[PDB]
Amino acid sequence: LYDRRSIFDAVAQSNCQELESLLPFLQRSKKRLTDSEFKDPETGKTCLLKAMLNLHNGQNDTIALLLDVARKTD
């Protein structure tokens, strides 16, 4: 299972393994990665923006992971 804090912590630490089950999680849950559950309640930022703000030497593998997930889900 996943929630906003878990995804944010994963992308912050560049943990591509932790998000391996995000695609089947969302597909079984029938809910989009862009849904208001994943947006910040105040700023409106999504997990992608959180990943973009945490880059290591200009690289963060979880960005391509998230983009692939969002492509595949809806």
Method by which the coordinates were obtained: cryo-EM
Judge whether 50 is annotated as a binding position.
yes
Judge whether 60 is annotated as a binding position.
no
| Burial class, 20, CB count within 10 angstroms (exposed 0-12 / middle 13-18 / buried 19+) | exposed
Judge whether 30 is annotated as a binding position.
no
**Resolution as reported, in Å:** 2.9
**H or E element, residue 46:** none
**Which CA distances in Å does 68 have to 33, 41, 42?**
11, 24, 26
Contact 11, 33 (CB under 8 A): no
Count of other CB atoms within 10 angstroms of residue 42? 6
Contact 47, 38 (CB under 8 A): yes
